[PDB]
Amino acid sequence: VEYFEKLRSALLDGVNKGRSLLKHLPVTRIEGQSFRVDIIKFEDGVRVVKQEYKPIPLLKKKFYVGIRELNDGTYDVSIATKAGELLVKDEESLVIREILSTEGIKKMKLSSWDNPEEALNDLMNALQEASNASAGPFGLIINPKRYAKLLKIYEKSGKMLVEVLKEIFRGGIIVTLNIDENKVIIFANTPAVLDVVVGQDVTLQELGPEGDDVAFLVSEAIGIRIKNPEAIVVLE
Amino acid sequence: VEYFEKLRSALLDGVNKGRSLLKHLPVTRIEGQSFRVDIIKFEDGVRVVKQEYKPIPLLKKKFYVGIRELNDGTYDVSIATKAGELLVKDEESLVIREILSTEGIKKMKLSSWDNPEEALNDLMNALQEASNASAGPFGLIINPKRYAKLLKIYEKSGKMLVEVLKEIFRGGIIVTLNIDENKVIIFANTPAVLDVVVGQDVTLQELGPEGDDVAFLVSEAIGIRIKNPEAIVVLE
Amino acid sequence: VEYFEKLRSALLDGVNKGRSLLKHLPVTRIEGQSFRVDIIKFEDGVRVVKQEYKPIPLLKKKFYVGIRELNDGTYDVSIATKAGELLVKDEESLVIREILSTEGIKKMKLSSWDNPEEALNDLMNALQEASNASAGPFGLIINPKRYAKLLKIVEVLKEIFRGGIIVTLNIDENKVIIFANTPAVLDVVVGQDVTLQELGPEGDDVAFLVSEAIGIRIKNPEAIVVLE
Amino acid sequence: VEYFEKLRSALLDGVNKGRSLLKHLPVTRIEGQSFRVDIIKFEDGVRVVKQEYKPIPLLKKKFYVGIRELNDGTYDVSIATKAGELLVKDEESLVIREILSTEGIKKMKLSSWDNPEEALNDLMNALQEASNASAGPFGLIINPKRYAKLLKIVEVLKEIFRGGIIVTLNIDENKVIIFANTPAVLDVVVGQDVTLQELGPEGDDVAFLVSEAIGIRIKNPEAIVVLE
């Protein structure tokens, strides 16, 4: 009836408020429960060296709205929000946790970033190493605390280091709180290397009266596939 | 016959997004499999000092798409991408190696670009040298590793060195990965000096079923015509 | 929605493939929860000698199918099948259990068949005692282990036990039932056919309930003989 | 052109005549390269106890028909048949190979049948252990050599092993499989039916590729018993 369309709406408008990583990476909507990871390399021609099948896990958060409240009209839609808001935090964390564990991605030394010069360096180096794999536009994923270290006037003119970096990393600068403050991901933002496989979208399901309140289920099928580890660099 | 038009597109794109040299040097669409270089010089007048016929070699790069995947439609178009992406690496590498080997080009001492001022000099001096042969806009082919040094701020000016170098060198700053980190080419970016002749564009040809997969052939005819060796100077 | 009708079917064509005893016994539909059992004997005419009311107990079996699977259509209908298989097993052993505990049924001494001339005897003997009640075809309900020891030559059982030779692990290995297969003797009364009900979301999966009402009426106990 | 449709047929009506095991097992179509295996057990209801993803491997067999023959129409379609025959043999032994290497399956001691009273025992025993998992009909997969030594009287196997008696040289002579033939236990999942593909001119003949995607899902390992 009502309490639904409203709850679901507040669920989504709470998912967007916290979703960032998934707004920039390339997403491919699959129809299944698992996907294949075709790893291509060069041996007497560019061909698929290793094939691998990975399952798309199910992400879910459940929220409960009082029965009574659902009838008074006195229910707090913000519950749904805290739910979705919480979903993406896991969704985002998943992606990052996987990229970081993927076998193949290159790892380099992440410095302090107190001298723009120093930070710009780390980035420029990571960027090169990665470019060797794919020319595709490059972007980086960083935590606010680091992002801040980039908010400095670089050229006596007035251009901030960030602004310069934005011209270099056309893949975008993804700032998320879900990545450890001391880890930076440099990557080719191209489906030919990075791919967020979507098995099931985000959906609100009304389980049902489980106590003095109704139970609800927010869930989504999601997973990333790294087709070209070589094109990703992690600054640890 | 859709898996083709798709692969070709992925190819052509990846090829394009990877080209650097071929986007800035001047190109001439030739006809045959060879071209003639009329080397122009000044000896009691501007005249053709030496004629020379050069053959345009064929650049090949082949990829294989599984048949299974080709049938159920789960083939990864990204192979075509990596393919062409790789094609250029040879295509550029060729042109570069061929310039560097051409006799007549001038060579100067390339220092370590740690003190922007030195770099700014080397470049300004190479500029001078080339300026003797031509006058046409001057540009430079340079490896990302060196280009980065140019992003540091030239203290005495307060701008990134690059930003200054772009004031001189209207020929463009070609940054390619296909030129020894420690070799820089300054040159007159003019058809009257440099010239990339293309015998055959980049094309995707479906070789044919060879095992469990289908073979494909990415290929192109290409070469550089250097008419004024003296308008090219290599910092090595 | 749709995964229902599909589960429902796998449920049935799992119950139908599993039924054995219940395929040989006569059946009657009754709309209710209890039924009346009429003991039919001959005393100056075929007459009803004793009345008696029994309740048709409910047989249930539940299964759960993941929520996800039900949504993305990748659920394994076999689940329903397994449910049905079990339902039947319970249903079958229930009938047997109840026959064995009915009033009049005649009991004889079953001898561990090791000396193959006594085996055929014990059967032929029971089948005799049975015949004294009702002449209708005779059925045999024996555990497979007994049907095993019964192989040492047995091919004419099908010639003598026309009523049917039900071999099932649902009757204690050390018991054998010989009965006159006929309405005048026993019959299955069904209060509710097998039905699939979608209970609902119950954790991470949806719950389903397979159920049926069913019982047996032994009208002429004397026509039944157990070998304990 | 036309020699295709003709080769294709000989290919099929060669695969169809050769299939054995695969004719008795239940089958399910799946559009994909991998499938999910659901372990179905009973724990307060028929429920899925374990998930797991397997990939459907590709089965291929190729044959070559002379260029000439293909042109003057004197090609021997039997070639395609032989191809198909082989495809099946590979397909069959693949299923068997995989059953034998599945997780839960119960293993028992198979005794070289030389003393005919032990033979029937080993089978009857396995068939027992199996029954404790699923009651569905039981199947027997035995090498012919064993089906040989099993002839010294065996005629009731068809009476006890209703699930089917698959005799094939595809199962190691010294191994025997007894299983509950039912979806609730195992089933074949096909990702791609048998298909004929004309690769092309490759020397003096044209090359052809026969292929198919196929695998087995053991949902209830306990319902399977190997005799090693």
Attribute tags:
part of a larger assembly; 4 chains; 236 residues; alpha/beta; Major capsid protein gp5 fold; Rhinovirus 14, subunit 4; hypothetical protein PF0899 fold; 3 domains; 5-stranded mixed β-sheet; 4-stranded mixed β-sheet; 7 helices; virus like particle; virus-like particle; virus; HK97
Describe this structure in words.
By secondary structure, chain A is an alpha/beta fold. The first copy, chain A, folds into three domains: 1-31 and 57-101 and 195-225, Major capsid protein gp5 fold; 32-56, Rhinovirus 14, subunit 4; 102-194 and 226-236, 2-Layer Sandwich (hypothetical protein PF0899 fold), CATH 3.30.2320. Chain A is 33% helix and 31% strand. Chain A contains seven helices and 13 strands. Chain A has a five-stranded mixed beta sheet with strand order 7-13-10-8-9. A four-stranded mixed beta sheet of chain A has the order 1-11-12-6. The A-B interface holds A 36, 38, 40, 42, 45-48, 117, 120-121, 124-125, 128, 131-132, 134-136, 154-157, 164, 190-193, 227-228 and B 10, 14, 17-18, 61-64, 66, 69, 74, 76-79, 81-83, 85-86, 144-145, 148, 151-153, 158-160, 163, 177, 213, 215. It is classed as virus like particle. The entry lists the keywords virus-like particle, virus, T4, Virus like particle. The entry is titled "Crystal structure of virus-like particle from Pyrococcus furiosus".
Summary of the model, kept short:
The structure is cut from a larger assembly and holds 4 copies of chain A. Chain A is α/β, with parallel strands linked by helices and 236 residues long. The first copy, chain A, has helices at residues 3-15, 21-24, 67-72, 78-101, 116-131, 144-150, 161-168; strands at residues 27-29, 34-36, 39-42, 46-50, 53-55, 58-66, 106-108, 138-142, 172-175, 184-188, 194-205, 213-226, 232-235.
